[PDB]
Design an enzyme around this catalytic site. Structure first.
Site, mmCIF file in Angstrom:
data_model
loop_
_atom_site.group_PDB
_atom_site.id
_atom_site.type_symbol
_atom_site.label_atom_id
_atom_site.label_comp_id
_atom_site.label_asym_id
_atom_site.label_seq_id
_atom_site.Cartn_x
_atom_site.Cartn_y
_atom_site.Cartn_z
ATOM 1 N N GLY A 85 21.255 -5.009 0.222
ATOM 2 C CA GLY A 85 21.680 -5.598 1.478
ATOM 3 C C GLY A 85 20.575 -6.312 2.236
ATOM 4 C CB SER A 86 19.343 -9.172 2.956
ATOM 5 O OG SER A 86 20.289 -10.021 2.330
ATOM 6 N N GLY A 87 20.039 -9.029 6.055
ATOM 7 C CA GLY A 87 20.658 -9.642 7.213
ATOM 8 C C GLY A 87 19.656 -10.100 8.252
ATOM 9 C CE1 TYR A 126 19.122 -5.080 6.518
ATOM 10 C CE2 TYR A 126 20.920 -5.756 7.959
ATOM 11 C CZ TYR A 126 20.466 -5.359 6.709
ATOM 12 O OH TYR A 126 21.348 -5.242 5.653
ATOM 13 C CB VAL A 181 17.698 -2.876 3.004
ATOM 14 C CG1 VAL A 181 17.627 -1.444 2.502
ATOM 15 C CG2 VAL A 181 17.455 -2.913 4.499
ATOM 16 C CE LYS A 200 14.149 -2.266 8.665
ATOM 17 N NZ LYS A 200 15.106 -2.046 9.787
ATOM 18 C CG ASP A 204 21.411 0.346 11.738
ATOM 19 O OD1 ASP A 204 22.479 -0.157 11.309
ATOM 20 O OD2 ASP A 204 20.304 0.175 11.181
HETATM 21 N N1 LIG Z 1 20.460 1.742 2.787
HETATM 22 C C1 LIG Z 1 19.704 2.102 3.792
HETATM 23 N N2 LIG Z 1 19.250 3.354 3.794
HETATM 24 C C2 LIG Z 1 18.467 3.747 4.827
HETATM 25 C C3 LIG Z 1 18.129 2.863 5.892
HETATM 26 C C4 LIG Z 1 18.669 1.521 5.799
HETATM 27 C C5 LIG Z 1 18.401 0.520 6.808
HETATM 28 C C6 LIG Z 1 17.104 0.169 7.454
HETATM 29 C C7 LIG Z 1 15.798 0.748 7.308
HETATM 30 C C8 LIG Z 1 15.174 1.382 8.435
HETATM 31 C C9 LIG Z 1 13.889 1.964 8.324
HETATM 32 C C10 LIG Z 1 13.200 1.925 7.084
HETATM 33 F F1 LIG Z 1 11.968 2.483 6.977
HETATM 34 C C11 LIG Z 1 13.786 1.310 5.960
HETATM 35 C C12 LIG Z 1 15.068 0.726 6.065
HETATM 36 N N3 LIG Z 1 17.328 -0.865 8.373
HETATM 37 C C13 LIG Z 1 18.656 -1.055 8.234
HETATM 38 N N4 LIG Z 1 19.427 -0.313 7.354
HETATM 39 C C14 LIG Z 1 20.910 -0.397 7.097
HETATM 40 C C15 LIG Z 1 21.634 0.711 7.907
HETATM 41 C C16 LIG Z 1 23.162 0.647 7.682
HETATM 42 N N5 LIG Z 1 23.758 -0.727 7.902
HETATM 43 C C17 LIG Z 1 23.052 -1.894 7.252
HETATM 44 C C18 LIG Z 1 21.509 -1.806 7.419
HETATM 45 N N6 LIG Z 1 19.457 1.185 4.724
#
Ligand SMILES: Nc1nccc(-c2c(-c3ccc(F)cc3)ncn2C2CCNCC2)n1
EC number: 2.7.11.24
Length: 351
Positions: A28-30, A32, A35, A50, A165
């Site tokens: 996933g990506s957006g 933010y 990821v 991320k 989030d």
């Molecule tokens: N799959 C997954 N698992 C855990 C966290 C996330 C994550 C992070 C994130 C945060 C901190 C970090 F250190 C690394 C990644 N930012 C957004 N998201 C997703 C959270 C659910 N909706 C889409 C984005 N995604």
């Protein structure tokens, strides 16, 4: 000095991460950032890495990046997202331009659970209990999540929940329009910006969440801001003189008064066949006047979570200095500030 990195092009995104992270796989990506799912050979955990997009492309982003690193570095609770690692392939502050964050990979959120239908009272006490535990910890540090919704609560096979989030960063703009779930959980006072919000807006969100877990249906699925306020006021009653004077906007007050007054509905007739203690808690969480809403720490003490409540095991957070929010710095100063926090990260112990 420093671990060895290895770079690999991933779905048009160059990832340069320490070799401890393997089997990176887009997930996933957006707005933010991107990821990736990976295996962390040092902790033995499957993690989410991320890679922030343009971390220092503006002062708004530079501050955003900083605000999230600072927040993730502080959050140290079981029921709240945490930082397992933060790194940058950048050898020096001069070449520092990318920030990657690592935390435990989350699989399903509360959503991939409720949708099924309504839940069992026990699983409702448990999940809500956990939400309130993280919350008592989040608020004790003067942090307001601002976006508590099912999709933001990571839930596992044994029904263990983690809040993620956070808001502290992104600014909801044009995303709260129409028949959107992104808004069905916002307190009315922050939804129409009647007044500057307090952390009880988070307690309102939990009530919305709890109600949905019980009935299996969104509590206030309004098709727009007004329709949703109508749904809320039909259940909670219209503002009283006490509340009306706490709303600054003369337009808001003027609008509100144009509405035919309504009494608070009987929650026992809304949540039919639900535990009287659950009903009693929703009545305390879903109070129009944010000043009279129950607090996380108080909710926990409520007889509904008797089976799980342990005063000595519901920790509070270390003081949290967010004085920087008032700081006016150039892109490069938030950038250097971000660098020190990266540079100074200390991994949490292991097992
Ligand atoms: N799959 C997954 N698992 C855990 C966290 C996330 C994550 C992070 C994130 C945060 C901190 C970090 F250190 C690394 C990644 N930012 C957004 N998201 C997703 C959270 C659910 N909706 C889409 C984005 N995604």
């Amino acid at each position: 000095e420093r671990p060895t990195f290895y770079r690999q092009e991933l779905n048009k995104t160059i990832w340069e991460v320490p070799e401890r992270y393997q089997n990176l796989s887009p997930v996933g990506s957006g707005a933010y950032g991107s990821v990736c799912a990976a295996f962390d050979t040092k902790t033995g955990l499957r993690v989410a890495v991320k890679k922030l997009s343009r971390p220092f492309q503006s002062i708004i982003h530079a501050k955003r990046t900083y605000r999230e690193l600072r927040l993730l570095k502080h959050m140290k609770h079981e029921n709240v997202i945490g930082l397992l690692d933060v790194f940058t392939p950048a050898r020096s502050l001069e070449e520092f331009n990318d920030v990657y964050l690592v935390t435990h990979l989350m699989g399903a959120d509360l959503n991939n659970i409720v949708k099924c239908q309504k839940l069992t009272d026990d699983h409702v006490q448990f999940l809500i209990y956990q939400i309130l535990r993280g919350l008592k910890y989040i608020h004790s540090a003067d942090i307001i999540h601002r976006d508590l919704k099912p999709s933001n609560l990571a839930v596992n096979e044994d029904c263990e929940l983690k809040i993620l989030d956070f808001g502290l960063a992104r600014h909801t703009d044009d995303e709260m329009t129409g028949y959107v779930a992104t808004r069905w959980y916002r307190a009315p006072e922050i939804m129409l910006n009647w007044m500057h919000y307090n952390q009880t807006v988070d307690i309102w969100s939990v009530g919305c969440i709890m109600a949905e877990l019980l009935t299996g249906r969104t509590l206030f699925p309004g098709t727009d801001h007004i329709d949703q306020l109508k749904l809320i006021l039909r259940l909670v009653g219209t503002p009283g003189a006490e509340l009306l004077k706490k709303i600054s906007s003369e337009s808001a007050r003027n609008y509100i008064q144009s509405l035919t007054q309504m009494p608070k509905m009987n929650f026992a007739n809304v949540f039919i066949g639900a535990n009287p203690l659950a009903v009693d808690l929703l009545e305390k969480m879903l109070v129009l006047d944010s000043d009279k809403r129950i607090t996380a720490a108080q909710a926990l003490a409520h007889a509904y979570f008797a089976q799980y409540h342990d005063p000595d095991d519901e920790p509070v957070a270390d003081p949290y200095d967010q004085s920087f929010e008032s700081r006016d710095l150039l892109i490069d100063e938030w950038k250097s500030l971000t660098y020190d926090e990266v540079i100074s990260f200390v991994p949490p112990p292991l097992d």
